[PDB]
Amino acid sequence: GTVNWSVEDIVKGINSNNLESQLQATQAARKLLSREKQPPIDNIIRAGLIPKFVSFLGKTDCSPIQFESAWALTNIASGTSEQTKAVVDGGAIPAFISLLASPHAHISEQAVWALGNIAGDGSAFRDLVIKHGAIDPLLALLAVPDLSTLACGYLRNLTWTLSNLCRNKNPAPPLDAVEQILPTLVRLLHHNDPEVLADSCWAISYLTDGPNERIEMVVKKGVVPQLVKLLGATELPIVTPALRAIGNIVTGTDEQTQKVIDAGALAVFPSLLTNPKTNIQKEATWTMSNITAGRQDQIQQVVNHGLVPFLVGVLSKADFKTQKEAAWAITNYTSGGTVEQIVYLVHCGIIEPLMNLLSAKDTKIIQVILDAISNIFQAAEKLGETEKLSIMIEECGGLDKIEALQRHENESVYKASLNLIEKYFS
């Protein structure tokens, strides 16, 4: 009946001034816009239909046309920034916010969804949704004793939309909006549904992607133990954002990093650092590199948890992007570690795999590796054992490469390779 209408017939129906004819035509539009293959979004916009759809959001006496128009506009707003802008320019933001309080749950949910698409376009539309007052009624839908009494789909949509209000930078979301959202977000982060958990983690990951003050707002709400629990989930859609959030947190202060350590995160890293998904191994090694940039007692907990052999492993064999993070994690460790800690690296086997990476093209990794070598020699000097290391380096072919490096385009490489050979190998 409403299947495969032409845009021309939708227009005729919308312009009829018969509400039921307008309802049928709006449903026909909704069905066109629901097709996965090339939904005709631009044809519908060019036909002038957005302002009519927006007026239909206010027809309290015809809840079906409210729903159909909300759905049609949701799918326009799911497109490009220009398509979303057409929806915003039609006045849809305050109309959708008014539908959040609708007694019809499927209409409230459709408005939640449309607002998630609008906010997800970017910081400006996100902040415009906030300025029109969306947060209070969104949060009111979740102000229940137990989230389990809400329909699963409704809760997933609310969580996803809140995650878009937490997303994006330049600027980050308004501080007061984040503070308003965080208590509800922390409750969603303890919910049992895997999609709610994943999107809650994504939201926390966005909130911790920023200066230490933004990290602190999140950490102060006590979410780190739950993040560490979710870091062990079986579902990779959960582990991935949990790990991003943990990784972001440990870019903060040593004291913020310590909360991650105290919550038990390091015991998960044997698995993360061998995870068969290369993105997880990479992000876990990046996280490690910001932990080994910490205090000596935090390096020591890395040692105690058995993680140095895992770093030797990634350096020996991993995707090249992961090996780069591993080189950074080692340089940081050698930069801040005690002499005993740095010696331990050599005993675990760091030298050979580090040398084998001096044959790579990326000039930045070579600078990183060379910096670590110096730090390691400097620690050996304090024990008088520079030759033993020089031997080690010779026997795995490292000196060959360090020498070939004397003649490499970059000049910081030049200088570094030269000083090592002059100072330790003559």
């Binding site: 629901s34 759905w71 459709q110 969804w113 998630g116 997303r167 990779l236 998904k277």
Partner: peptide, 13 residues
């Protein structure tokens, strides 16, 4: 393979 958030979502049903 990398898991990523969903920026916008079309409602197909």
């Amino acid at each position: 393979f990398e898991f990523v958030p969903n920026t916008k979502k079309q409602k197909c049903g």
